[PDB]
Design a protein around this motif. Structure first.
Motif, PDB file in Angstrom:
ATOM      1  N   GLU A 167       0.882  -1.295  -0.108  1.00 45.33           N
ATOM      2  CA  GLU A 167      -0.051   0.097   0.162  1.00 45.33           C
ATOM      3  C   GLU A 167       0.830   1.162  -0.107  1.00 45.33           C
ATOM      4  N   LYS A 168       0.230   2.235  -0.550  1.00 50.59           N
ATOM      5  CA  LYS A 168       1.056   3.544  -0.581  1.00 50.59           C
ATOM      6  C   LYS A 168       1.337   4.071   0.702  1.00 50.59           C
ATOM      7  N   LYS A 169       2.557   4.534   0.942  1.00 49.15           N
ATOM      8  CA  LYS A 169       2.996   5.223   2.260  1.00 49.15           C
ATOM      9  C   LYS A 169       2.380   6.477   2.162  1.00 49.15           C
ATOM     10  N   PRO A 170       2.121   7.008   3.496  1.00 45.52           N
ATOM     11  CA  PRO A 170       1.357   8.334   3.583  1.00 45.52           C
ATOM     12  C   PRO A 170       2.539   9.458   3.296  1.00 45.52           C
TER      13      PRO A 170
ATOM     14  N   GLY B  17       8.818   2.600  -5.657  1.00 47.38           N
ATOM     15  CA  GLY B  17       7.455   2.661  -5.872  1.00 47.38           C
ATOM     16  C   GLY B  17       7.327   2.635  -7.797  1.00 47.38           C
ATOM     17  N   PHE B  18       6.267   2.900  -7.985  1.00 49.77           N
ATOM     18  CA  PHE B  18       5.791   2.611  -9.660  1.00 49.77           C
ATOM     19  C   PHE B  18       5.561   3.909 -10.005  1.00 49.77           C
ATOM     20  N   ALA B  26       7.317   1.737  -0.676  1.00 49.02           N
ATOM     21  CA  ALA B  26       8.543   1.386  -0.121  1.00 49.02           C
ATOM     22  C   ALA B  26       9.382   2.212   0.565  1.00 49.02           C
ATOM     23  N   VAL B  27       9.351   2.496   1.796  1.00 50.74           N
ATOM     24  CA  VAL B  27      10.199   3.639   2.452  1.00 50.74           C
ATOM     25  C   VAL B  27      10.993   2.660   3.653  1.00 50.74           C
ATOM     26  N   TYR B  88      12.520  -7.592  -4.933  1.00 44.17           N
ATOM     27  CA  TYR B  88      11.769  -8.894  -4.441  1.00 44.17           C
ATOM     28  C   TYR B  88      11.367  -8.967  -3.203  1.00 44.17           C
ATOM     29  N   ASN B  89      11.877  -8.604  -2.020  1.00 44.17           N
ATOM     30  CA  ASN B  89      11.269  -8.604  -0.753  1.00 44.17           C
ATOM     31  C   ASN B  89      10.405  -7.496  -0.220  1.00 44.17           C
ATOM     32  N   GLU B  90      10.462  -6.420  -0.950  1.00 42.91           N
ATOM     33  CA  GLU B  90       9.803  -5.161  -0.351  1.00 42.91           C
ATOM     34  C   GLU B  90       8.675  -4.668  -1.614  1.00 42.91           C
TER      35      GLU B  90
END
Ligand SMILES: Nc1ncnc2c1ncn2[C@@H]1O[C@H](COP(=O)(O)OP(=O)(O)O)[C@@H](O)[C@H]1O
Ligand SMILES: [Mg+2]
Lengths: 173, 371, 173
Positions: A167-170, B17-18, B26-27, B88-90
């Motif tokens: 899911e998108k992070k805020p 991200g995309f 992904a952070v 792969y993992n995230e």
């Protein structure tokens, strides 16, 4: 946690097994609150010997993928968690037989339900916290090396694993 | 169809991200921790590297290394672990069918982006690749095409002045003072009260201190006179083991080295007369449009009061008729990524990738020509 | 500017499209001084996604003229402004979703109206300034090459463009 709840039951043999174990462990985690089907300590022991048997079958399912993986640098992230399942199920077998004979030799006044069967919940939630990284390190090892010979004979495509994009992070707060 | 990946692999934090979205998927921190203690239980072991988020839940038995220092990738075997973790993992994608948009600071070594090209093509096997500059992508995400971008991150801060899509490369300044040199100054400045943080896992506690209690004073020599007369500026913080520390005038003395870098022994000027000495190296016709479009990006520009302090210090240098407007968006931590999702999902950008077929007729030196 | 106000509404498809986009831009221009129908930030985001759609249709209409030109020496001033409106609407689409989530996550107190919605007005002023050059570069390529086969099939005479001759320059002062 909720990562297992974000999967679908129409997956392959490993995700249908890892979602059965989270349904067993969900019966034991609310025993600290008393909102489950397990009434006293004698059901927690029978549930701990059930999750230790289902967890001992994903040791068998994970090792078939670890034998078809051709690259020796890929299995090292997978065999590190197949050795933690082999320990946490051996504790759940033996530390339930100990709490079985304490209940018979002493009675019901010895074990107090909560804060007495918490040695079985702690060994079970450490099995569940080491079973979602052998379906994530096994998902990597079955799609990164999908085109290799031997892995395709297992019939595990990338669409069989029912994991979605996160899911998108805020942005703020 | 075949949505591109936008992996802003900065120091200290990795945002992926995309392309075409509006938020990263992904952070996670850019650390690779290895255990330093002795394992006694059989089974706990055979796993000598934790990457990203599980190296901070399991810190206290690990030594935490940063592979990117000052924007330059120092460890090339630990940077492959973070790229393998974030695909792969995230993100749970296969890199063989997505082109990726990497991101690099200006004025870096040319062998830094020559090896990012070699890794993504010969190890991850991406179909296409592109390496962009950070401060040009935080103008895409700000709704502008003219402006000067102060991009303060974790390794470097740099100014890139841009007028109508034309960059002036002789006025690009770069400092090596950034947010990680405010963490190491907060470790030294906290020893005056007794608290001594030493280890690599205790530097992540004092990093969480500066993200919660540190702020920028609008007048420094007046704020130090009211931090000693009373005790209205002190605030308490609770450590992970239950202890409570109390911080007084170290709340504004830590972000003050961005404006006075003589506190850390650096000879360079502050960030208020680095963003002005790069305007005054631009041509005289475009200086009125850079004073009014002053974009601030990156995570270190998120202190409470860094915009009201910086307007005070450029109006004292600029001529008295120019109006100075500093654009600090509320989402300015992810501004470099959002302009990366704008650029990679663009209709006219799709002939500017470095394709894998192009990588064979050249070497890794094709990234200098095409970018 | 006031050049769009000097055009007539009974023109062809491109003139009536560039007259609607200046009516949207005039609703966001006076919001910087607070004299428009758009009252808060939540109406500026709906208008910026509207001007990014009408501006994305003149990229379609402008490319039906750019391919019918016979030689490649005349459309270089037309494709240079068609690629600028490809960028200025992609910013207006994505930086309106970004400012919708910041308004949704942090609440309505994060956005301030003026000096917060100026990232959408500045990206729309540059769209309007690069769409009146797309009208003027398409008017030249529709009358300089009118007699060629292919351009007359669009049915665009010089009388359909309702642009007049400019005013007389002042002699003194
Ligand atoms: N609220 C805050 N106040 C001060 N510094 C902050 C704050 N939030 C994040 N930072 C700093 O921002 C940096 C991480 O953000 P970012 O600029 O994205 O990093 P990087 O460029 O290294 O990827 C770190 O140095 C961190 O300490
Ligand atoms: Mg950055």
């Amino acid at each position: 946690d909720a990562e297992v709840s974000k999967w679908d039951d129409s997956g392959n043999d490993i995700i249908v097994l890892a979602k059965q174990m989270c349904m067993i462990m969900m019966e034991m985690t609310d025993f600290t609150r008393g909102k489950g089907p397990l009434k006293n300590t004698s059901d927690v022991i029978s549930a701990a010997k059930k999750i230790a048997e289902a967890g001992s079958r994903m040791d068998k399912l994970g090792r078939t993928i670890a034998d078809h993986c051709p690259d020796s640098a890929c299995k090292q992230d997978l065999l590190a968690y197949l050795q933690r399942i082999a320990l946490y199920c051996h504790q759940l077998n033996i530390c339930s037989k100990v709490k079985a004979e304490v209940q018979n030799l002493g009675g019901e006044l010895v074990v107090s339900g909560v804060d007495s069967a918490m040695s079985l919940i702690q060994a079970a939630k450490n099995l569940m916290n080491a079973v979602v990284q052998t379906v994530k390190a096994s998902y990597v090892a079955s799609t990164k090396y999908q085109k290799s010979q031997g892995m395709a004979s297992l019939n595990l495509p990338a669409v069989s694993w029912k994991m979605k994009a996160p899911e998108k992070k805020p942005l703020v707060k | 169809e075949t949505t591109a990946l936008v992996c802003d692999n900065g120091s200290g934090l990795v945002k992926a991200g995309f392309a075409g979205d509006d938020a990263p998927r992904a952070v996670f921190p850019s650390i690779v921790g290895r255990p330093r203690h002795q394992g006694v239980m059989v089974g706990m072991g055979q796993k000598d590297s934790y990457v990203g988020d599980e190296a901070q839940s399991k810190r206290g038995i690990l030594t935490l290394k940063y592979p990117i220092e000052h924007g330059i990738i120092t460890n090339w075997d630990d940077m492959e672990k973070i790229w393998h973790h974030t695909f792969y993992n995230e993100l749970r994608v296969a890199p063989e069918e997505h082109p990726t948009l990497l991101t690099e600071a200006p004025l870096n070594p040319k062998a830094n982006r020559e090896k990012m090209t070699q890794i993504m093509f010969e190890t991850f096997n991406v179909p296409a690749m592109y390496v962009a500059i950070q401060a040009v992508l935080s103008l895409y995400a700000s709704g502008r095409t003219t402006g000067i971008v102060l991009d303060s991150g974790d390794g470097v801060t740099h100014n890139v002045p841009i007028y109508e899509g034309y960059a002036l490369p002789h006025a690009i300044m770069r400092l090596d003072l950034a947010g990680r040199d405010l963490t190491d100054y907060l470790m030294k400045i906290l020893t005056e009260r007794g608290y001594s943080f030493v280890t690599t896992a205790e530097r992540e506690i004092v990093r969480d201190i500066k993200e919660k209690l540190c702020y920028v004073a609008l007048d420094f020599e007046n704020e130090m006179a009211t931090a000693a007369s009373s005790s209205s500026l002190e605030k308490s913080y609770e450590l992970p083991d239950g202890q409570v520390i109390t911080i007084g005038n170290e709340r504004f003395r830590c972000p003050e080295t961005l404006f006075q870098p003589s506190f850390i022994g650096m000879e360079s000027a502050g960030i208020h007369e680095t963003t002005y000495n790069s305007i005054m190296k631009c041509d005289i016709d475009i200086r009125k449009d850079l004073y009014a479009n002053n974009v601030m990006s990156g995570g270190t520009t998120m202190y409470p009061g860094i915009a009201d302090r910086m307007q005070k210090e450029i109006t004292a240098l600029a001529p008295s008729t120019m109006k100075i407007k500093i654009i600090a968006p509320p989402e300015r931590k992810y501004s470099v990524w959002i302009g990366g999702s704008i650029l990679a999902s663009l209709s006219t950008f799709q002939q500017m990738w470095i394709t894998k077929q192009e990588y064979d007729e050249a070497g890794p030196s094709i990234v200098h020509r095409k970018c």
